[PDB]
Design a protein around this ligand. Structure first.
Ligand code: HEM
Ligand SMILES: CCCCCCCC/C=C\CCCCCCCC(=O)O
Length: 458
């Protein structure tokens, strides 16, 4: 009964190669509009790469990530390039290797443990507010500012008091390593990393610098409510059935927490603020809520308990992640033949599900380009399929850092909203690109007007 997937319209020789280089996100949206919810992207010339399938329905995303998750593995080439760059930690590992890591790391990400990091988030957000009050011109570029803030937040939680000493190195090296692996990962032709090309030599130096830094911090904590940092918790990980992580395993988990938690949260934070800067009525609503909860400009630090008291900001962040999903595609590889929405996905095919497309699917989202936090009332959520929204994925390999990201984002943004008015400036439309991560192709310019002189004793 299963139909052949339609080939997305492209170049007669080169298939979708030029369209995916120039504008992948528009290409994905066109693919759904013209060809349906299960499609295939063809490369050219023939033989360069097998056809890549895509699944855009909420039902199909649930099937691939959850219902039939065992048939859709992390066997894409780009996963192997990530393993080669950061080790085979929680995001890339599979089978028994993954089950050991999950048993050892899931305890570190209980709601209560993650909540204990609220003061680190609050403190870093107060530090950013102090920095912004200090800008003579009152102007920022939100992509860059949130890239820096999000790394400081995840660094504080991983390394505590040692965040400041290691920040510069991670800030400079981590992005270069990710670019090398993901660009290698998506390229149909690549060199062995053993070739001494300039790019391989540059990558090997960067990897060596970052590995030595991580190894030193980890070895320092190997001697080991609680404000304990996450590497200390990783060093302490263990149970009656699984012994502790070794040095190689500790390094691979520290690197994946940084990689998986830095730019993802940064993108959500930047665009939430940019959207509020372009939508004053929604900004007024979040300000009124933050002022009620924290007692206005110059008021108190937010706490973990305040998450339940900031529902509107929480809806704002969900809507920002609907429109600007940090993982716009999620890749898998089919083991055996499958059928999604009456369409065949053959054994061995690479495929992707797409928060980008599903978050804009007209079947689930009226006026899908419109920014509307009220889409995330409990009632509005019940009126759409479960996987209409899935920026953190879903099922057995869903983001372990979802709640942490929301603690960082809700508490961090509440401080900034308590302390600044945001005014968009310049070109307010931000062009986007994408690989497996969302790419800002323009600035999110913003004027930040202080609401107070900052903290004052009482
Ligand atoms: C808004 C921010 C974030 C987004 C959009 C996001 C997105 C995702 C997605 C889509 C996945 C699933 C990938 C797949 O199924 O192949 C994932 C997994 C993961 N994320 Fe996040 N993430 C975010 C924040 C964080 C943070 C702060 C951490 C810090 C620990 C983190 C760590 C991870 C890890 C370790 C995994 C692998 C989980 C597993 O396989 O069990 N993420 N993330
Ligand atoms: C791993 C799934 C394949 C692509 C989906 C992306 C979802 C995984 C998590 C986060 C987004 C990007 C993947 C690499 C993590 C790095 C974080 C980043 O810089 O985006």
């Amino acid at each position: 009964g299963a139909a052949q997937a339609p080939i997305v319209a492209g170049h007669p020789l080169l298939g979708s190669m030029n369209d995916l280089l120039n504008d992948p996100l528009a290409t994905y949206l066109r693919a759904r509009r013209d060809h349906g919810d299960v499609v295939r992207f063809r490369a050219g010339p023939p033989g360069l790469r097998a056809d890549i399938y895509a699944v855009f329905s909420a039902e199909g995303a649930q099937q691939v990530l959850a219902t039939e998750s065992g048939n859709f593995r992390k066997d894409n080439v780009f996963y192997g390039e990530l393993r080669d760059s950061v080790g085979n930690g929680l995001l890339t590992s599979q089978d028994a290797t993954y089950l050991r890591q999950r048993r050892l790391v899931q305890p570190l990400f209980t709601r209560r443990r993650v909540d204990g990091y609220a003061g680190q988030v609050a403190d870093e957000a107060a530090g950013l507010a102090e920095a912004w009050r200090g800008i003579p011109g009152g102007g920022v570029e939100l992509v860059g500012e949130m890239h820096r803030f999000a790394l400081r937040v995840v660094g504080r939680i991983l390394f505590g008091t040692d965040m400041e000493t290691t920040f510069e190195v991670i800030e400079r090296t981590l992005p270069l390593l990710q670019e090398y692996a993901l660009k290698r990962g998506l390229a149909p032709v690549r060199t062995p990393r053993t070739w001494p090309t300039p790019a391989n030599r540059r990558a090997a130096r960067t990897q060596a610098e970052l590995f030595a830094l991580c190894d030193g911090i980890i070895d320092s904590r190997r001697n080991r409510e609680s404000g304990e940092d996450l590497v200390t918790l990783l060093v302490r990980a263990g149970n009656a059935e699984d012994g502790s992580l070794d040095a190689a395993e500790l390094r691979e988990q520290v690197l994946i927490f940084l990689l998986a938690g830095h730019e993802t949260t940064a993108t959500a934070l930047a665009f939430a603020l940019h959207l509020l800067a372009r939508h004053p009525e929604q900004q007024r609503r979040v300000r009124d809520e933050a002022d009620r909860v924290l007692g206005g400009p110059g008021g108190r630090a937010p706490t973990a308990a305040d998450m339940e008291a900031l529902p509107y900001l929480t809806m704002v962040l969900k809507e920002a992640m609907r429109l600007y999903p940090s993982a716009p595609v999620i890749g898998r590889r089919a083991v055996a033949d499958a059928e999604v929405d009456g369409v065949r996905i053959p054994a061995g095919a690479d495929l992707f599900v797409s928060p980008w497309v599903t978050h804009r699917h007209p079947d689930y989202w009226p006026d899908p380009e419109r920014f509307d936090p009220e889409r995330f009332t409990p009632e509005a959520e019940a009126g759409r399929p479960r996987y209409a929204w899935f920026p953190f994925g879903g099922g057995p390999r869903a983001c372990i850092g979802q709640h942490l990201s929301m603690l960082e984002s809700v508490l961090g943004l509440a401080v900034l909203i308590r302390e600044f008015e945001f005014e968009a400036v310049g070109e307010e439309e931000v062009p986007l690109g994408a690989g497996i991560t969302l790419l800002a192709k323009g600035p999110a310019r913003c004027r930040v007007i202080p609401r107070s002189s900052g903290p004052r004793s009482s």
